[PDB]
PDB file of N, CA and C and ligand atoms in Angstrom:
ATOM      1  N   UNK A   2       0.812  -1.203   0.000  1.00  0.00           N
ATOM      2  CA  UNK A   2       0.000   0.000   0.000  1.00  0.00           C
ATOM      3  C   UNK A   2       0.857   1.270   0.000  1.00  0.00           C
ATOM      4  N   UNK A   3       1.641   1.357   0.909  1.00  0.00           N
ATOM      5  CA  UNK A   3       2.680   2.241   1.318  1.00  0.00           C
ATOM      6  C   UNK A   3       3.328   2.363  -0.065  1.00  0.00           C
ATOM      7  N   UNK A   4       4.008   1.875  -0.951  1.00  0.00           N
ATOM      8  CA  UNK A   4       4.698   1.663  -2.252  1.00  0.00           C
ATOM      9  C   UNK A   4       3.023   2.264  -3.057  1.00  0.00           C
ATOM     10  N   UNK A   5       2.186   1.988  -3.243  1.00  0.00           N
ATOM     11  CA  UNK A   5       1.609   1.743  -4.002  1.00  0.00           C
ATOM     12  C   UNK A   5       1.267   3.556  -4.499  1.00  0.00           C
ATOM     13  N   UNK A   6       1.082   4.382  -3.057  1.00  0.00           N
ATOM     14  CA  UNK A   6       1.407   5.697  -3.020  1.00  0.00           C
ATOM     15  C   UNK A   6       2.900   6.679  -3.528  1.00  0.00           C
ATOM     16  N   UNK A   7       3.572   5.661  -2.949  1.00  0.00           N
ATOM     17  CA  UNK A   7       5.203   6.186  -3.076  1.00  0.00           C
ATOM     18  C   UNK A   7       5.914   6.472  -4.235  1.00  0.00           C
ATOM     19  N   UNK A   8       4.862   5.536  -5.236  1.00  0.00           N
ATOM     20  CA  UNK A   8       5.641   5.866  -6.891  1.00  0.00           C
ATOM     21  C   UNK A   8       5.732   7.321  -7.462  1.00  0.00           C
ATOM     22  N   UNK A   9       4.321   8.058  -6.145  1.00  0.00           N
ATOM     23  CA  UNK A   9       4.374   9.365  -6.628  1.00  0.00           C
ATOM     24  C   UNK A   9       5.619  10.234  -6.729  1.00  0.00           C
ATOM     25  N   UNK A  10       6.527   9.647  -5.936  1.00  0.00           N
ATOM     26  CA  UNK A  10       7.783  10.330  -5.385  1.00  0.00           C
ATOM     27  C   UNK A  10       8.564   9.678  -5.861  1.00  0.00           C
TER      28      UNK A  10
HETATM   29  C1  I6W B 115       1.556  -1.456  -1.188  1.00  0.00           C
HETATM   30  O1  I6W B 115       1.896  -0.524  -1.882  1.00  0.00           O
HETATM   31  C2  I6W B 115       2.526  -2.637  -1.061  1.00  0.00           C
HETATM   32  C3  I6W B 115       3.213  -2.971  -2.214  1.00  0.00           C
HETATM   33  C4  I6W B 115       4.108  -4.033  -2.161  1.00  0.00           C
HETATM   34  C5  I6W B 115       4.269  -4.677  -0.979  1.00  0.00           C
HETATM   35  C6  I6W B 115       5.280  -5.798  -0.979  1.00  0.00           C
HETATM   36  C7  I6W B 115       5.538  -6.485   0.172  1.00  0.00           C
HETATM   37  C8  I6W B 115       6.484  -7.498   0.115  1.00  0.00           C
HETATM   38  C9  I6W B 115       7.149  -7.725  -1.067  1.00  0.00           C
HETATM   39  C10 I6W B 115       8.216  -8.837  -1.082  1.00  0.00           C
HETATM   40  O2  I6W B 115       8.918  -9.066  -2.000  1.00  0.00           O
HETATM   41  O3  I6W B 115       8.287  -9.540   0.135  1.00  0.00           O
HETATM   42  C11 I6W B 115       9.306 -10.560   0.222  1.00  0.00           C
HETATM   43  C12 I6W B 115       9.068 -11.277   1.571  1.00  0.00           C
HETATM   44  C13 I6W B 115       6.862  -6.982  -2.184  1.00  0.00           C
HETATM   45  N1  I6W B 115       5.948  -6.048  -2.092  1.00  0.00           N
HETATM   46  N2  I6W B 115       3.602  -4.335   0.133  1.00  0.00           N
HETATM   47  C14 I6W B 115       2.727  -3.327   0.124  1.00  0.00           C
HETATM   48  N1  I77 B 116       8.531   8.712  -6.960  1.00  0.00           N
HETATM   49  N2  I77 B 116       9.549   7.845  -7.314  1.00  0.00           N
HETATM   50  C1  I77 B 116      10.514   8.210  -8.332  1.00  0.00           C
HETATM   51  O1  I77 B 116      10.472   9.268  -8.882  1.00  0.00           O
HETATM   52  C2  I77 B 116      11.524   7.120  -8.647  1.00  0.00           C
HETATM   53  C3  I77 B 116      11.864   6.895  -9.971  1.00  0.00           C
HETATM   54  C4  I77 B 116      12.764   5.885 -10.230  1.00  0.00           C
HETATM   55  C5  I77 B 116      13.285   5.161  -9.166  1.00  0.00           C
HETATM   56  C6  I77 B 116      14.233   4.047  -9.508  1.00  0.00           C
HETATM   57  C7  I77 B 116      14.611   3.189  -8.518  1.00  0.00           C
HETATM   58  C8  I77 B 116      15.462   2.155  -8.849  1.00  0.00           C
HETATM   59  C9  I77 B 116      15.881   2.006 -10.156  1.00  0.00           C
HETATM   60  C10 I77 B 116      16.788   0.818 -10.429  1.00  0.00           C
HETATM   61  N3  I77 B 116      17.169   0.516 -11.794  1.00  0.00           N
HETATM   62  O2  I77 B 116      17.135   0.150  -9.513  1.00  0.00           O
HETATM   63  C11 I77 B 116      15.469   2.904 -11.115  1.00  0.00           C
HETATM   64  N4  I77 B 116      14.671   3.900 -10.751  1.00  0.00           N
HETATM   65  N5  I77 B 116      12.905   5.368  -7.906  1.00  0.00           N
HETATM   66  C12 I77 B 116      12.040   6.327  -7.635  1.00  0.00           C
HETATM   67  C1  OXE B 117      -4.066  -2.825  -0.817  1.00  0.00           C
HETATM   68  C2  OXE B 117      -4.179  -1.493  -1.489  1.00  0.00           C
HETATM   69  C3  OXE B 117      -5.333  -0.746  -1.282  1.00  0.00           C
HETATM   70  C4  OXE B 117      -5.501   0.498  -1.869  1.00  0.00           C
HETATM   71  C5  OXE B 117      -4.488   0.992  -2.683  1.00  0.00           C
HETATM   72  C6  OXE B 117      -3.330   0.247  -2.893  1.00  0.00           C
HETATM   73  C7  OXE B 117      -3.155  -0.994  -2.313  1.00  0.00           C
HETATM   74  C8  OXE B 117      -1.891  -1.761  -2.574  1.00  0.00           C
HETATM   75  C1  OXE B 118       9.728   1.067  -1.017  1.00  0.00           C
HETATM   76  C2  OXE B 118       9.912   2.518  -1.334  1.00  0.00           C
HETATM   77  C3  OXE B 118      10.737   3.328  -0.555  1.00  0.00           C
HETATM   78  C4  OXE B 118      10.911   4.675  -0.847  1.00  0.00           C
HETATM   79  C5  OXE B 118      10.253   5.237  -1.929  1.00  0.00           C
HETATM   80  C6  OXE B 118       9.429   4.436  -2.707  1.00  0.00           C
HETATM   81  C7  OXE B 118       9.246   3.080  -2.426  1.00  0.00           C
HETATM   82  C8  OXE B 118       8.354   2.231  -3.284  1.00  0.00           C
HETATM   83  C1  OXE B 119       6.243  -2.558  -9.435  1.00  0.00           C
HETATM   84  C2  OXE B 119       6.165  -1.331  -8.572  1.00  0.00           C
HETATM   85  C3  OXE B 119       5.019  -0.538  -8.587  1.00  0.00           C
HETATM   86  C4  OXE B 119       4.924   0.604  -7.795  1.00  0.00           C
HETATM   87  C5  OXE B 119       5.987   0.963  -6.974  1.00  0.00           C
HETATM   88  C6  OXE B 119       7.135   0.179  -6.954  1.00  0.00           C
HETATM   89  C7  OXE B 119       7.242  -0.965  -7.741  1.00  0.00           C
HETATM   90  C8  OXE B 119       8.494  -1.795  -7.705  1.00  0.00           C
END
């Protein structure tokens, strides 16, 4: 989940 946000960055 955490990754799934993180690609934003
Ligand atoms: C939510 O974004 C998210 C994405 C990916 C994962 C995750 C957990 C574990 C692995 C892995 O290779 O584990 C090896 C034990 C890969 N991806 N968790 C949450
Ligand atoms: N928000 N995330 C990024 O902008 C981002 C772009 C690309 C990468 C990344 C990581 C690792 C590799 C590699 N070949 O191991 C390439 N690009 N991380 C974050
Ligand atoms: C489990 C889950 C739920 C909502 C968004 C992304 C992910 C990986
Ligand atoms: C696991 C990880 C760590 C830092 C930035 C992005 C991601 C997907
Ligand atoms: C395949 C994938 C998707 C989103 C963030 C990180 C990674 C390795």
């Amino acid at each position: 989940l955490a990754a799934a946000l993180a690609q934003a960055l």
